[PDB]
Amino acid sequence: AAVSALAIGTAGLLSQVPVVGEAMGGLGAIIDALTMKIDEDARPAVGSF
Amino acid sequence: TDDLYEVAEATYEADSSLEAFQTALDGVNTAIDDVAVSTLQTEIEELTG
């Protein structure tokens, strides 16, 4: 019970850290999608010209 | 870009050709009118007038 309490404690931190940090990694995909979006503006711009 | 700048050159060399129509074509129109016609009439006068 004690050793599992300790190991579930560490597993708590070592899953919270990924599931938060890689949510900010989902935000990474958002930021990168916004870069695709930004260059998808330059396409119409020079298109229009 | 390398369409549009050259579309620009295409428009500019359209315009340059199109101004050169006005000067070249009138260049032909003026080749004979100011030159042969009246002189032929004067030579008709001296021949036969």
B2 phi and psi angles, rounded to 5 deg: -85, -10
Q: Does A46 touch chain B (CB under 8 A)?
A: yes
The answer to whether residues A46 and B1 touch, using CB atoms and an 8 Å cutoff, is: yes
The secondary structure of B1-49 as a DSSP string is: -TTHHHHHHHHHHHHHHHHHHHHHHHHHHHHHIIIIIHHHHHHHHHHT-
B13 phi and psi angles, rounded to 5 deg: -85, -15
- CB within 8 A of B14, min separation 6: which ones? none
The answer to whether residues B5 and A46 touch, using CB atoms and an 8 Å cutoff, is: no
From residue B32, give the alpha-carbon distance in Å to each of A1, A12, B11, B28, B35: 116, 101, 33, 8, 5
Spatial CA neighbour of A47 closest among A39, B45, A33, A4: A39
User: Which residues from B are below 8 Å from A49, CB to CB?
Assistant: 4
How far apart (Å, rounded) are the C-alpha atoms in residues A47 and A25?
Answer: 33
Which amino acid is present at B41? Q
Query: Which token pair is A14?
Result: 């070592």
Which amino acid is present at A30? I
User: Which residues from A are below 8 Å from B1, CB to CB?
Assistant: 46
Q: What H or E segment, with its residue span, contains residue A6?
A: helix A2-21
How far apart (Å, rounded) are the C-alpha atoms in residues B40 and B43?
Answer: 5
Instruction: Report the residue of chain B nearest A44, measured CA to CA.
Output: B1
